[PDB]
Design a protein around this ligand. Structure first.
Ligand SMILES: CNC(=O)c1ccc(S(N)(=O)=O)cc1
Length: 185
């Protein structure tokens, strides 16, 4: 892919974070804390899952960013509507306003309804995410494997402004404490 030149500087929005997340000073890294993090509750925070949004909102154009997932066992990445549900249980699907992939139990899957099996030969340490708003496309690239395509959502019905979306995952196993990091341009 030649999407690198639509690179955007993404930062995390503290106010949307689950109350157990720890966002770095530079707002470029997030990890699961071992407790509640001593913040007030608000209507933006994801309550049920270790999720956070980017601060940036996109309503046009082409955008590209990269995320480091080194040594994590579980995570979700992609984009979502600004108006997605924050409280209670929900599935990651385009019907609910999410365009995402994930790692879970040693398999990679795209967040379609129902979920789609991904075929990745080289486990990624960094993921590239490309959004073309006008085309209705969200694509995922394996930066560890020379940028190889992972998955393309096409004919997307965004139906609103988009935000970068992150889930660091739970750490029941003790093997999933590592952060998500936004990689430098
Ligand atoms: C409301 N959150 C929880 O009940 C919760 C919070 C943290 C964990 S972990 N991943 O073991 O650190 C599990 C569950």
């Amino acid at each position: 892919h030649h999407h690198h030149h639509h690179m955007v500087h993404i930062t995390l929005d503290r106010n949307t974070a689950n109350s157990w997340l720890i966002i770095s000073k530079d707002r470029r890294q997030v990890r699961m804390g071992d407790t509640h993090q001593n913040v007030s509750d608000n209507k933006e925070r994801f309550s049920n899952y270790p999720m956070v949004l980017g601060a940036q909102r996109f309503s046009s154009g082409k955008m590209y960013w990269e995320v480091d997932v080194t040594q994590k066992e579980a995570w979700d990445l992609g984009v979502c509507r600004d108006s997605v549900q924050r409280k209670g249980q929900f599935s990651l699907s385009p019907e609910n306003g999410f365009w995402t992939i994930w790692l879970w139990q040693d398999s990679y899957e795209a967040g379609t309804s129902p979920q789609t099996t991904l075929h990745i030969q080289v486990p990624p340490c960094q993921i590239g995410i490309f959004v073309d708003y006008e085309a209705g496309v969200v694509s995922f690239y394996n930066i560890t494997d020379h940028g190889s395509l992972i998955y393309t959502f096409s004919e997307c019905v965004f139906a609103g402004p988009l935000r970068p979306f992150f889930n660091v995952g739970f750490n029941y196993s003790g093997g999933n404490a590592a952060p998500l990091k936004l990689c430098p341009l």
